[PDB]
Design a protein around this ligand. Structure first.
Ligand SMILES: [Mg+2]
Ligand SMILES: [Mg+2]
Ligand SMILES: [Mg+2]
Ligand SMILES: [Mg+2]
Ligand SMILES: [Mg+2]
Ligand SMILES: [Mg+2]
Length: 538
């Protein structure tokens, strides 16, 4: 009786998958990477087109030996690593250590850890995708060449122990450019006027807009006076009434970027914690006697697609719980089972897992719902050329907002309302906001620089390196970060450059699809970079 071997990256994953598979399957964790570049040397074969020189990781020897013994005992080997570039290179390193044939169909991929998703994966296993593997290799070779080339230069000109990276340097320069804008900003005093009116004895508020049919900027207390003195009596003509219905569509389901943004904005999660907790949700949590189950789809994704089956089950949850009026190869981040309401499984989750799951559940359900609808009214109240604007809003259909506004007294053109009081208020303009974790992520996504694997580590290493601090939830450059940024701008300008770095990520994308040869991406980077390293070592 010889079993099937299934290798996974973590024990929590193996425990979860173990129940799903049954007798003729043995499930073991490799506990992270087992092969890596050498730590004590560059570990790139520059005579053989940048081929990485890998070793078995220092310390993992005994683990590796036991994997080899289990593989000998096994009937067939299945590599069940996560479905991304990194998971494919893990599977390739295991193939290498276990002497498996790369033409064999030993790779099984799934994007949630549920009994149904797991078993469908073994129905059609595939061979290892060497394009995905080469895309991981390229990133690893790039980051190694950059890190081990620049770091000694920082040690020479700044301080021992320093390091830099590609996307980390882009982010740091973006933060320093924003700080330069802040320093150069010139605040200005300006004033507003709140008005309080009545139609009948129904009170409401309208804000000063301007004089003589233009918007008016009030720069001082004297400008407020000039408005005030134009106001003779309390009578205001309803010069116009505007009405509309406003449709607020539903957000898309979470990607890695939008999950990280929402978690940081809404529940004060640092991005590292968001990914840590998502991983717990994903790899499997004990739901009591029903044992461990994966509660969300895989959390590293840039897809917003929902699968047909997942779509149908949510429509049914929505139709049944709100009304059918609220409905309509990778995937977004969603509950694996929508019927696992946050309320139901609350008792099985710690507080942090409860928050992130609640966030992911709400967002995915909302995203499967219909638009909210509002009833707008804009009302112009004019006297003697002075214009106040009243605004009113109420919801005509909650729509997706089901999972989570004042109205105006009635008016038509020509009626009259009475002015009770006006409240001038002093303000000062503010500079552009600092990057929060949210807006940094959003910026890195929109400008083409970030990817699901690189969002959280970039914001981690920039803080581990002490190049920025994070106060009142926004990044500020440190003095050391300014020093390092200036050196790299001086000697390696392209690695702070947004466009060159988004270009590189797109070339990595092409490697993944087999459109470009990974060694060529490295060579087009390395040939110019090499010259800059020589000149910086002068
Ligand atoms: Mg070894
Ligand atoms: Mg990668
Ligand atoms: Mg990178
Ligand atoms: Mg590396
Ligand atoms: Mg800044
Ligand atoms: Mg991550």
């Amino acid at each position: 009786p010889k079993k099937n071997l299934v290798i996974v990256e973590s024990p929590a994953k193996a425990k979860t998958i173990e129940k799903y598979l049954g007798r003729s399957y043995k499930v073991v964790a490799s506990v992270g990477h087992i092969r890596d570049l050498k730590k004590s040397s560059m570990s790139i074969d520059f005579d053989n087109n940048y081929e990485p020189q890998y070793i078995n990781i220092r310390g993992k020897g005994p683990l590796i030996n036991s994997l080899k013994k289990e593989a000998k005992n096994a009937k067939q080997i299945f590599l069940a690593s996560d479905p991304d570039r990194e998971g494919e290179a893990i599977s390739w390193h295991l193939a290498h250590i276990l002497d498996l044939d790369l033409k064999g169909k030993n790779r099984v991929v799934f994007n949630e850890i549920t009994k149904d998703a797991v078993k469908n994966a073994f129905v059609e296993p595939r061979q290892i995708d060497m394009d995905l593997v080469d895309a991981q290799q390229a990133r690893r070779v790039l980051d190694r060449i950059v890190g081990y080339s620049i770091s000694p230069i920082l040690w020479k000109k700044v301080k021992k122990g320093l390091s830099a990276g590609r996307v980390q340097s882009v982010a740091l320069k973006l933060i320093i450019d924003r700080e330069n804008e802040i320093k150069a900003f010139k605040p200005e005093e300006y004033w507003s006027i709140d008005g309080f009116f009545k139609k009948g004895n129904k009170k409401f508020q309208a804000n000063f807009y301007g004089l003589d049919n233009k918007k008016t900027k009030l720069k001082s207390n004297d400008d407020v006076k000039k408005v005030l003195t134009r106001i003779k009596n309390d009578d205001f003509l309803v010069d116009k009434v505007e009405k509309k219905e406003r449709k607020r569509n539903a957000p898309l389901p979470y990607t890695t970027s939008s999950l990280q943004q929402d978690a940081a904005n809404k529940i004060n999660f640092r991005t590292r914690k968001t990914m840590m907790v998502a991983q717990q949700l994903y790899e499997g949590i004990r739901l009591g006697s029903n044992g461990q189950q994966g509660l969300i789809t895989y959390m590293r994704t840039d897809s917003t697609r929902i699968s047909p089956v997942a779509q149908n089950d949510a429509a049914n949850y929505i139709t049944e719980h709100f009304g059918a009026e609220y409905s309509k190869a990778h995937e977004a981040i969603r509950p694996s089972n929508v019927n696992h309401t946050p309320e139901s499984i609350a008792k099985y989750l710690d507080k942090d897992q409860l928050k992130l799951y609640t966030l992911i559940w709400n967002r995915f359900v909302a995203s499967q719902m219909t638009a909210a609808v509002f009833d707008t009214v804009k009302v112009n109240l004019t006297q003697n050329g002075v214009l106040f604007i009243a605004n009113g809003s109420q919801i005509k259909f909650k729509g997706y907002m089901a999972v989570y506004t004042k109205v105006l007294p009635e008016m038509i053109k020509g009626e009259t309302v009475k002015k009770i009081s006006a409240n001038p208020e002093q303000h000062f303009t503010q500079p552009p906001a600092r990057y929060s974790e949210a807006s940094l992520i959003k910026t890195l996504e929109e400008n083409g620089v970030g990817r699901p694997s690189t969002y959280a580590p970039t914001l981690e290493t920039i803080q581990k390196r002490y190049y920025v601090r994070l106060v009142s939830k926004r990044f500020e450059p440190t003095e050391l970060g300014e020093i390092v940024n200036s050196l790299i701008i001086e000697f390696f300008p392209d690695i702070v450059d947004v466009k060159f770095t988004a270009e590189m990520e797109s070339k990595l994308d092409e490697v993944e699809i087999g459109k470009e040869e990974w060694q060529k991406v490295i060579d087009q980077f390395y040939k110019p970079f090499e010259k800059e390293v020589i000149k910086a070592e002068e």
